[PDB]
Structure 1
Amino acid sequence: EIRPTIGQQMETGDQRFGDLVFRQLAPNVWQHTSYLDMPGFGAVASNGLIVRDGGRVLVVDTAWTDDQTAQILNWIKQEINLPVALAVVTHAHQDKMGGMDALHAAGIATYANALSNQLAPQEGMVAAQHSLTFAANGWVEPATAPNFGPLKVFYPGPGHTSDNITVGIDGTDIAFGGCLIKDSKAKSLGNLGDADTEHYAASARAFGAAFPKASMIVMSHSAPDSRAAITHTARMADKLR
């Protein structure tokens, strides 16, 4: 088994597929996990989502690499055998956007915050092909998110990065905090190199208020948790202000 240095371990309910791990979270939602083997450190796990919406599939976040992302597409083909309509990527960092080329080669429409697309070159990423824009209260402008089905995109404010976005899964009790949210037992807020330490706490709380009835909080670097992930993240961030 892959025992990452950072990120959750493999537990019962997990399926190893190639270099990745998949975990079913709901009848129509799965978590993908991929690993970056860092020099002198070991593997760092990162999570995204796969959502079935009738006769199509929707993806949230790439894996760290193009090859790993192609493996996600192979898993979908094997296990679901439905086409991927679109992918939403949650900010311009390698764990979320490192595999854009694999999505594009597959002909999948990609979406990111306009700011993520603007930052992508400096961050060493390939931009998504479509830009999401947001209202003053953080909700996505619906005309920029056409045919998103159950994906409800929310920009909570600057936190882990200035561009980080979040996604609620309508028709479920799941919401995805990406890298903004850390689990309820987290020791740190992770890599703060690109973070907005002033606004982080309010952004974390804004994500909780946007999806007030989501009981299963999915995040990039821990297993799914309760709403205490939101509260605990915000309390850690209160110390940065």
Structure 2
Amino acid sequence: KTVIKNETGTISISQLNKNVWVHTELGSFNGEAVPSNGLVLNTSKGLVLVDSSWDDKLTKELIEMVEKKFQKRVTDVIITHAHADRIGGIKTLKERGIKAHSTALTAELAKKNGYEEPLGDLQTVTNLKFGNMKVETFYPGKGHTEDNIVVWLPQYNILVGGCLVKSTSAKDLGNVADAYVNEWSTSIENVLKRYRNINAVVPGHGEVGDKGLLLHTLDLLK
């Protein structure tokens, strides 16, 4: 049930479990309100985000909300690809001394698109631990973008799909200009192969689902 919104209503967080919430922000795309998801991980060494938000204003507001609520600092963010939706708050992170993890390719792409660079520290498979919280990052191949990664929480069997994974409500692939529609199916299969028992799947946009969201993505690719 538990859902907390900000003043203006533009930001929301909703609990999945004792230490794991989804954050969602309404941003401005072409040309309506469009929601974007990530994760807030409440660990004993601080707050870790899987993705920040659309722009600096929303990222600052997000950080401020979870800092106030959980009474600890945001220490780390995992940036799941280099579109503005994911990388847009990078300047806020760097200036606050928040570590912005990404693959090298995501870092390269950010800079090519004129953003400040995340760390480029993540390999194809990276295993991180913050306090007691275990976090795996996985590059499954190209799909929604060249660089898109997923994030797995092995203690909860929770998969952050990012924009690689479409919600039920999504009835097409979205913007495919940066996409690789042949390789996207294989990428999704690589996820299904690596993570055989999944409790919950967080799509880049839309409502939390399960493994069925990955199967939905495959169908939308046919």
TM-score of the alignment, normalized to the shorter chain, above 0.5:
yes
Aligned to 2:121: 131
The TM-score, its normalising length taken from structure 2, stands at 0.91
Q: Which amino acid in the other structure matches residue 192 of structure 1?
A: V
Q: Which amino acid in the other structure matches residue 84 of structure 1?
A: V
Aligned to 1:27: 18
Q: State the distance in 2 between where 1:113 and 1:77 align.
A: 26
Q: Is the 8 A contact 2:169 2:206 kept in 1?
A: no
Aligned to 1:194: 178
| SS in structure 1 at match of 2:207 | coil
Deviation of residue 69 (structure 1)? 0.6
Deviation of residue 82 (structure 1)? 1.3
| SS in structure 2 at match of 1:96 | helix
Residue 202 of structure 2 is aligned to residue 218 of structure 1: yes
Does 177-186 or 216-225 show the bigger shift? 177-186
Q: State the aligned residue count.
A: 219
Structure 1 residues not aligned, in runs of 5+? 1-11
Q: Given the superposition, is the C-alpha separation of residues 15 and 147 from structure 1 closer, same or farther in structure 2, using an over 3 Å criterion?
A: closer
Q: Which amino acid in the other structure matches residue 15 of structure 2?
A: Q
Residue 111 of structure 2 is aligned to residue 121 of structure 1: yes
Q: Is the 8 A contact 2:2 2:14 kept in 1?
A: yes
Pairing 1:163-182 to 2, within 5 Å after superposition: 163-182=147-166
Deviation of residue 147 (structure 1)? 5.5
Deviation of residue 128 (structure 1)? 0.4
Q: Is the 8 A contact 1:29 1:51 kept in 2?
A: yes
RMSD, aligned α-carbons: 1.8
Flag as ranges the 4+ runs of structure 1 deviating above 6 A. none
Residue identity over aligned pairs, in percent, reads 30
Aligned to 2:35: 45
Q: Which amino acid in the other structure matches residue 30 of structure 1?
A: W
Q: Which amino acid in the other structure matches residue 3 of structure 2?
A: D
Deviation digits for residues 159-180 of structure 1 (CA, Å, limit 9, x no counterpart): 0001000001121131101000
Q: 1:183 aligns with which of 167, 174, 184?
A: 167
Deviation of residue 185 (structure 1)? 4.5
Structure 2 residues not aligned, in runs of 5+? none
The TM-score, its normalising length taken from structure 1, stands at 0.85
Pairing 1:33-182 to 2, within 5 Å after superposition: 33-38=24-29, 41-134=31-124, 139-140=125-126, 142=127, 149-182=133-166
Q: State the distance in 1 between where 2:25 and 2:168 align.
A: 22
Residue 35 of structure 2 is aligned to residue 16 of structure 1: no
Q: Is the 8 A contact 1:22 1:31 kept in 2?
A: yes
Deviation of residue 146 (structure 1)? 7.2
| SS in structure 2 at match of 1:51 | strand
